[PDB]
Design an enzyme around this catalytic site. Structure first.
Site, PDB file in Angstrom:
ATOM      1  N   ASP A  49     -12.658   8.346  -8.218  1.00  0.00           N
ATOM      2  CA  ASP A  49     -13.977   8.792  -7.695  1.00  0.00           C
ATOM      3  C   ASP A  49     -13.792  10.098  -6.919  1.00  0.00           C
ATOM      4  O   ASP A  49     -14.830  10.643  -6.488  1.00  0.00           O
ATOM      5  CB  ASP A  49     -14.676   7.706  -6.870  1.00  0.00           C
ATOM      6  CG  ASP A  49     -14.059   7.366  -5.521  1.00  0.00           C
ATOM      7  OD1 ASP A  49     -12.989   7.914  -5.206  1.00  0.00           O
ATOM      8  OD2 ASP A  49     -14.694   6.645  -4.745  1.00  0.00           O
ATOM      9  N   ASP A  51     -15.215  -5.113   9.258  1.00  0.00           N
ATOM     10  CA  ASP A  51     -16.409  -4.612   8.499  1.00  0.00           C
ATOM     11  C   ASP A  51     -17.143  -5.739   7.756  1.00  0.00           C
ATOM     12  O   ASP A  51     -18.306  -5.497   7.356  1.00  0.00           O
ATOM     13  CB  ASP A  51     -16.034  -3.477   7.529  1.00  0.00           C
ATOM     14  CG  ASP A  51     -17.210  -2.825   6.814  1.00  0.00           C
ATOM     15  OD1 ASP A  51     -17.997  -2.152   7.505  1.00  0.00           O
ATOM     16  OD2 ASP A  51     -17.366  -3.062   5.610  1.00  0.00           O
ATOM     17  N   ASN A  67      -9.085   4.925   3.023  1.00  0.00           N
ATOM     18  CA  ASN A  67      -9.834   5.753   2.034  1.00  0.00           C
ATOM     19  C   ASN A  67     -10.803   6.716   2.733  1.00  0.00           C
ATOM     20  O   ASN A  67     -11.483   6.333   3.714  1.00  0.00           O
ATOM     21  CB  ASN A  67     -10.479   4.769   1.078  1.00  0.00           C
ATOM     22  CG  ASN A  67     -11.263   5.301  -0.097  1.00  0.00           C
ATOM     23  OD1 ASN A  67     -11.979   6.272   0.015  1.00  0.00           O
ATOM     24  ND2 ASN A  67     -11.323   4.518  -1.167  1.00  0.00           N
ATOM     25  N   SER A 127     -12.084  10.330  -4.049  1.00  0.00           N
ATOM     26  CA  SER A 127     -11.638   9.985  -2.678  1.00  0.00           C
ATOM     27  C   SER A 127     -10.104   9.888  -2.717  1.00  0.00           C
ATOM     28  O   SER A 127      -9.504   9.854  -3.794  1.00  0.00           O
ATOM     29  CB  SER A 127     -12.258   8.712  -2.170  1.00  0.00           C
ATOM     30  OG  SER A 127     -11.750   7.611  -2.889  1.00  0.00           O
ATOM     31  N   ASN A 131      -7.996   8.613  -5.830  1.00  0.00           N
ATOM     32  CA  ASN A 131      -8.819   7.613  -6.541  1.00  0.00           C
ATOM     33  C   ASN A 131      -9.553   8.323  -7.672  1.00  0.00           C
ATOM     34  O   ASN A 131      -9.753   9.542  -7.599  1.00  0.00           O
ATOM     35  CB  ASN A 131      -9.712   6.922  -5.511  1.00  0.00           C
ATOM     36  CG  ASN A 131      -8.922   6.226  -4.406  1.00  0.00           C
ATOM     37  OD1 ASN A 131      -9.212   6.354  -3.200  1.00  0.00           O
ATOM     38  ND2 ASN A 131      -7.883   5.515  -4.799  1.00  0.00           N
ATOM     39  N   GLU A 184       0.839  -1.208   0.000  1.00  0.00           N
ATOM     40  CA  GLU A 184       0.000   0.000   0.000  1.00  0.00           C
ATOM     41  C   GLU A 184       0.874   1.257   0.000  1.00  0.00           C
ATOM     42  O   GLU A 184       0.523   2.205  -0.745  1.00  0.00           O
ATOM     43  CB  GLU A 184      -0.892   0.000   1.243  1.00  0.00           C
ATOM     44  CG  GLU A 184      -1.983  -1.041   1.190  1.00  0.00           C
ATOM     45  CD  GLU A 184      -3.039  -0.837   0.106  1.00  0.00           C
ATOM     46  OE1 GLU A 184      -2.944   0.150  -0.663  1.00  0.00           O
ATOM     47  OE2 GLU A 184      -3.916  -1.758  -0.061  1.00  0.00           O
ATOM     48  N   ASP A 222      -6.691   7.997  -0.579  1.00  0.00           N
ATOM     49  CA  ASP A 222      -6.131   6.983   0.355  1.00  0.00           C
ATOM     50  C   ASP A 222      -4.952   7.593   1.118  1.00  0.00           C
ATOM     51  O   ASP A 222      -4.082   8.278   0.498  1.00  0.00           O
ATOM     52  CB  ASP A 222      -5.629   5.751  -0.363  1.00  0.00           C
ATOM     53  CG  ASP A 222      -6.683   5.057  -1.203  1.00  0.00           C
ATOM     54  OD1 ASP A 222      -7.858   5.148  -0.892  1.00  0.00           O
ATOM     55  OD2 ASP A 222      -6.250   4.352  -2.102  1.00  0.00           O
TER      56      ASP A 222
END
Ligand code: NA
Length: 129
Positions: free
Chosen positions: A48, A101, A59, A50, A46, A35, A52
């Site tokens: 979209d 999650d 995110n 967003s 990202n 990562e 990270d």
């Protein structure tokens, strides 16, 4: 801060990530390697819009507030900047919520694609832990 491999393994163990939700420490070190290359200041935008953040590239769509991700949540109740600290406490605490999650460490696409099923113990091999 750019951690060393064994230095990060020790920090993650100190913060209770070793075998958290059944994921051995090598899994967490492997995910952090792909990562962020162990850099707490890592960021990635990202498609979209967003972003990270940090050693585990958490995110803004769901987990932290950065003020520039429309419609997003802040389920870790932190500014995304906290994820860039030399102190990994915020990243670890937030990673614990993420891996709880439902999809475990699949939440981290790099973990699924580059760590899952591999000899992840090699990531802590030789470390004094
Ligand atoms: Na957010």
């Amino acid at each position: 801060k750019v951690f060393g491999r064994c230095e990060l393994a020790a920090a993650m163990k100190r913060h209770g990530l070793d075998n958290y939700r059944g994921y051995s420490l090598g899994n967490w070190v492997c995910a952090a390697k792909f990562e962020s290359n162990f850099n707490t200041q890592a960021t990635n935008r990202n498609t979209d819009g967003s972003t990270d953040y940090g050693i585990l590239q958490i995110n803004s769509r769901w987990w932290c507030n950065d003020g520039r991700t429309p419609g997003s949540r802040n389920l870790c109740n932190i500014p995304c900047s906290a994820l860039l600290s030399s102190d990994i406490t915020a990243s670890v605490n937030c990673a614990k919520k993420i891996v709880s999650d439902g999809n475990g460490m699949n939440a981290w696409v790099a973990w699924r694609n580059r760590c899952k099923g591999t000899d992840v113990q090699a990531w802590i091999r030789g470390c004094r832990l």
